[PDB]
Amino acid sequence: HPAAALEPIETASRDELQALQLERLKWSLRHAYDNVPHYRRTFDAAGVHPDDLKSLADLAKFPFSTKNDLRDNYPFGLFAVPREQVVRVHASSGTTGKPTVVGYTARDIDTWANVTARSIRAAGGRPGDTLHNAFGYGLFTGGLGIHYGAERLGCMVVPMSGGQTEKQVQLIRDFEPKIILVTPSYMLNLIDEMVRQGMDPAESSLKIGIFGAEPWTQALRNEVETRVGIDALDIYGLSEVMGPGVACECVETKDGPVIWEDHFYPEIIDPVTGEVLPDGSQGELVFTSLTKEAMPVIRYRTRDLTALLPPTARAMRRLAKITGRSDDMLIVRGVNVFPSQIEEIVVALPLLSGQFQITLSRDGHMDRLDLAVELRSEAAASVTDGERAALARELQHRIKTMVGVSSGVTVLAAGGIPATATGKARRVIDRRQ
Amino acid sequence: HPAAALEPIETASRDELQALQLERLKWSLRHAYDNVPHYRRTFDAAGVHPDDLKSLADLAKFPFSTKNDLRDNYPFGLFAVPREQVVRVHASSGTTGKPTVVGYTARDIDTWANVTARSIRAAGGRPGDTLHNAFGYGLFTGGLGIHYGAERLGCMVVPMSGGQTEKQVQLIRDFEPKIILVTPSYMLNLIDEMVRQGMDPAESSLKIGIFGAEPWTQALRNEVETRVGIDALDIYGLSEVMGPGVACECVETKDGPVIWEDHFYPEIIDPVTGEVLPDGSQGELVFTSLTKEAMPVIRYRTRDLTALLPPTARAMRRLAKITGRSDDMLIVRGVNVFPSQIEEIVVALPLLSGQFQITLSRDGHMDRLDLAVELRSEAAASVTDGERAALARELQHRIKTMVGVSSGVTVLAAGGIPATATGKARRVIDRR
Numbered sequence: 001h002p003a004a005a006l007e008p009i010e011t012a013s014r015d016e017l018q019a020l021q022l023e024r025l026k027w028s029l030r031h032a033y034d035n036v037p038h039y040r041r042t043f044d045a046a047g048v049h050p051d052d053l054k055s056l057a058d059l060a061k062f063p064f065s066t067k068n069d070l071r072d073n074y075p076f077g078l079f080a081v082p083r084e085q086v087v088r089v090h091a092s093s094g095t096t097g098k099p100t101v102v103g104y105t106a107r108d109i110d111t112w113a114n115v116t117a118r119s120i121r122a123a124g125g126r127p128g129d130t131l132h133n134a135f136g137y138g139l140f141t142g143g144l145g146i147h148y149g150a151e152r153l154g155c156m157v158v159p160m161s162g163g164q165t166e167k168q169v170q171l172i173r174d175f176e177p178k179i180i181l182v183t184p185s186y187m188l189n190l191i192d193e194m195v196r197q198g199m200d201p202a203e204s205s206l207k208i209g210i211f212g213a214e215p216w217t218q219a220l221r222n223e224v225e226t227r228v229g230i231d232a233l234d235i236y237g238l239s240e241v242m243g244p245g246v247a248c249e250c251v252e253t254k255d256g257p258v259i260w261e262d263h264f265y266p267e268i269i270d271p272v273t274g275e276v277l278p279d280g281s282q283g284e285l286v287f288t289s290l291t292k293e294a295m296p297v298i299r300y301r302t303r304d305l306t307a308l309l310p311p312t313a314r315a316m317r318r319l320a321k322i323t324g325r326s327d328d329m330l331i332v333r334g335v336n337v338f339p340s341q342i343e344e345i346v347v348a349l350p351l352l353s354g355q356f357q358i359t360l361s362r363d364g365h366m367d368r369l370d371l372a373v374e375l376r377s378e379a380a381a382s383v384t385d386g387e388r389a390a391l392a393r394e395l396q397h398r399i400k401t402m403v404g405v406s407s408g409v410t411v412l413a414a415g416g417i418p419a420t421a422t423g424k425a426r427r428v429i430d431r432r433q
Numbered sequence: 434h435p436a437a438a439l440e441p442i443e444t445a446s447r448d449e450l451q452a453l454q455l456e457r458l459k460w461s462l463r464h465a466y467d468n469v470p471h472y473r474r475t476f477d478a479a480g481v482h483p484d485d486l487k488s489l490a491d492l493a494k495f496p497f498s499t500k501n502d503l504r505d506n507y508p509f510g511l512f513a514v515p516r517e518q519v520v521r522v523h524a525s526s527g528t529t530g531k532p533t534v535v536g537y538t539a540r541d542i543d544t545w546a547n548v549t550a551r552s553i554r555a556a557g558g559r560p561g562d563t564l565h566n567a568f569g570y571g572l573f574t575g576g577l578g579i580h581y582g583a584e585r586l587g588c589m590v591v592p593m594s595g596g597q598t599e600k601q602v603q604l605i606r607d608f609e610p611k612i613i614l615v616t617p618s619y620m621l622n623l624i625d626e627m628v629r630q631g632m633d634p635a636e637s638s639l640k641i642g643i644f645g646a647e648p649w650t651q652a653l654r655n656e657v658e659t660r661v662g663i664d665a666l667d668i669y670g671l672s673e674v675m676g677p678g679v680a681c682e683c684v685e686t687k688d689g690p691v692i693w694e695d696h697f698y699p700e701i702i703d704p705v706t707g708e709v710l711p712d713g714s715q716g717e718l719v720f721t722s723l724t725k726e727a728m729p730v731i732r733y734r735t736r737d738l739t740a741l742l743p744p745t746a747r748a749m750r751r752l753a754k755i756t757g758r759s760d761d762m763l764i765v766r767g768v769n770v771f772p773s774q775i776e777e778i779v780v781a782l783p784l785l786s787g788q789f790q791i792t793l794s795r796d797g798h799m800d801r802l803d804l805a806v807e808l809r810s811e812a813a814a815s816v817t818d819g820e821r822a823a824l825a826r827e828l829q830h831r832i833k834t835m836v837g838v839s840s841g842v843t844v845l846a847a848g849g850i851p852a853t854a855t856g857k858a859r860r861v862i863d864r865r
């Protein structure tokens with residue numbers, strides 16, 4: 001429409017694809033090196049120059065980037081263009097109170113829309129389909145990324161965003177979307193609300209669900225597909241690389257997300273040593289962007305554990321199950337949360353010692369985050385019961401506001417959280433299984 | 434950058450503008466009549482036909498449309514193209530539990546981006562400026578309309594959306610926007626938060642504030658301009674017509690929103706008789722779209738009371754103060770709320786009689802919505818205090834969810850709300 005068709009590159013030969021990748025990879029390395037002081041330093045210190053890349057395998061010579069490099073160059077230090085050529089910024093959780101920040105040229109936004117349209121098409125969406133977009137609109141990459149891709153595909157986009165459960169179901173009923181884009185966790189909430197409204201979940205217009213932003217199981221898939229009468233497809237990404245639409249599953253094979261590696265070049269490494277592993281081996285997923293202008297990323301470590309699998313329905317490889325992470329990051333209802341994020345907010349309250357413990361659990365199918373924090377000892381003496389309840393509320397509101405997750409808060413006497421014999425607490429107890 | 438400069442039509446002659454309007458009006462009326470059964474019907478019933486329009490003055494022959502017509506044709510009954518050619522819907526409060534729903538073709542989106550870019554440019558914005566967009570992103574037209582306009586103009590858009598007050602100020606501090614787009618009420622919240630963070634409001638990077646979605650005073654303008662060190666400009670619109678970017682003020686003259694009447698054709702009428710009034714005269718603003726494909730609107734009554742003023746900085750006319758409305762609609766923090774909307778949610782709870790009263794008040798500079806409802810008599814006798822407090826919280830949450838506004842809720846005994854001698858209550862007491 002024109003976007004009903006596959007792009008030529010989607011069905012290109014392995015040779016054609018690898019030639020394109022090599023030509024873009026040379027450009028992207030040199031773009032990074034010339035235009036981003038950090039990469040100039042980081043390459044120089046590693047003894048490597050862009051010229052050193054003669055073949056795809058030569059990528060292993062180049063250093064890794066991580067979340068720390070963004071943190072150390074906040075807010076815009078990793079831009080490879082002047083800010084006056086940057087039309088979009090997006091923001092998500094960092095390890096400190098400064099968000100992780102990414103920027104995009106006009107071309108970058110166009111590229112993003114194109115791969116996100118490609119993803120929705122791979123999953124079976126078409127021009128003219130009504131599409132219910134329940135990913136968060138705003139600083140998160142999910143909502144706006146899915147928005148542009150769907151609009152580029154010629155879908156009728158319902159910009160629902162991520163809350164208002166009764167209204168979600170009202171509009172699914174009234175607007176009759178064929179496609180829903182939503183976290184897998186919130187999809188379950190929506191099914192529950194259909195039931196409470198007297199709507200059998202299989203009596204909906206939906207034929208396709210495209211789920212991402214967090215891991216989900218085969219069992220969740222079977223449960224959604226069966227109850228709602230849809231094909232459910234897996235859409236992957238992360239803000240640093242672009243957003244959603246880094247990889248997406250094809251409905252013809254349903255055999256895991258296809259990585260759009262004409263744009264986003266994947267490697268798998270041992271998470272401990274950093275050595276590159278052969279395709280089929282489980283390790284940590286690393287990306288190098290091939291077409292990004294504003295913020296090229298070079299061997300960016302996702303911390304996601306997975307594996308690369310051979311091409312099937314496309315010219316490109318696939319991801320295996322994403323089985324966890326190699327850092328301490330939590331995802332709650334699609335929202336990235338670091339324990340250190342919470343710590344910073346906890347310590348900011350002068351009545352609290354800084355001692356804290358997050359317990360994650362499952363209440364039915366819903367994740368629950370519960371936060372215990374300790375008073376300073378001098379404070380137990382003087383803080384009233386009403387004062388410590390308000391302290392709990394205030395802490396809950398700041399975490400909701402600054403991190404973006406809802407949490408139960410409990411305020412304990414000093415020593416109230418079980419510690420090592422010298423006072424060290426386990427920061428995260430995840431019982432969600 | 435292809436959006437730094439004015440468009441030719443912006444400084445065209447009045448003759449040339451009116452000739453474009455007439456041609457586009459002929460097209461719009463016929464597009465509506467040919468393709469929307471509703472309009473076929475209302476035109477026919479009014480004894481008029483698109484051919485009947487031979488000059489701009491002939492528009493007064495055509496019937497008005499209103500929110501009711503959207504209500505009666507929900508969700509998509511006023512589309513003039515197949516739904517498969519519509520790429521966007523947006524939704525805002527109706528008088529019922531069904532939202533007011535509007536649709537756009539790909540071309541429509543492009544047209545809307547163009548007039549919103551033009552608006553932000555009029556207010557002094559330029560390609561390369563960092564713009565902090567704090568209008569709500571989602572079903573509201575505000576967030577996404579401003580988004581596409583600012584992107585089109587080549588601003589660095591920060592897609593902040595409407596909440597998270599501490600984070601708003603953190604990112605204004607850190608990202609150093611030159612432009613903020615936000616409701617005028619929420620701008621005041623933001624200034625308070627600056628103070629609480631130990632930031633003097635005048636030590637921001639901001640140079641331009643573009644405020645709308647609701648009426649604001651000269652006094653609010655003076656306060657914001659003084660305290661923040663900016664020029665504040667007024668941007669107007671409504672979802673049925675397109676969104677924000679129907680009209681916007683020029684920083685050159687700061688004499689009220691310029692109507693982009695190459696796209697949106699204004700009339701002022703007496704809100705009682707429907708008679709068209711001469712420019713300079715106070716009445717009700719009525720729009721007819723000139724370029725819209727998916728949902729052409731013909732003589733749509735905004736219910737906004739204002740006047741048309743002569744051109745100054747552009748070829749196009751300006752709006753006077755928007756002084757109020759000719760219906761019972763409320764706006765709280767940019768969110769449209771109908772009393773009938775609230776009634777529908779109240780009546781849905783089977784313990785409650787349906788008797789209700791909204792009190793609006795000003796808590797400092799902040800609007801409060803406070804809602805009293807009555808139990809049915811048989812229920813007072815039997816509902817505990819815990820249950821009745823839970824009822825209040827549930828009503829509060831359903832109003833927040835379905836209407837989009839926060840409110841205090843009180844649950845009273847039957848007759849607890851002052852009524853007429855035969856039990857009619859005043860629905861709205863606006864003390865703001």
Ligand SMILES: Nc1ncnc2c1ncn2[C@@H]1O[C@H](COP(=O)(O)OC(=O)Cc2ccccc2)[C@@H](O)[C@H]1O
Binds near residue numbers: 092141143331
């Ligand atoms: N399909 C998925 N399966 C498993 N994990 C996922 C999946 N999608 C994203 N994640 C996790 O979340 C991260 C990035 O979170 P971030 O907030 O940066 O970006 C958005 O989650 C972008 C997104 C939005 C909508 C759909 C898909 C992707 C990644 O490193 C994974 O750990």
Ligand SMILES: Nc1ncnc2c1ncn2[C@@H]1O[C@H](COP(=O)(O)OC(=O)Cc2ccccc2)[C@@H](O)[C@H]1O
Binds near residue numbers: 648668
């Ligand atoms: N600048 C303003 N001055 C006074 N009232 C305004 C102004 N802007 C809009 N209103 C009121 O809000 C309605 C429409 O509400 P609705 O939600 O459909 O559309 C968005 O308020 C669109 C908007 C978004 C952001 C900025 C400006 C305009 C309109 O009929 C007026 O009563």
Ligand SMILES: [K+]
Binds near residue numbers: 213214336
């Ligand atoms: K995520």
Ligand SMILES: [K+]
Binds near residue numbers: 646647764767768769
């Ligand atoms: K409004």
Ligand SMILES: [Mg+2]
Binds near residue numbers: 204229
């Ligand atoms: Mg179904």
Ligand SMILES: [Mg+2]
Binds near residue numbers: 640
């Ligand atoms: Mg200033």
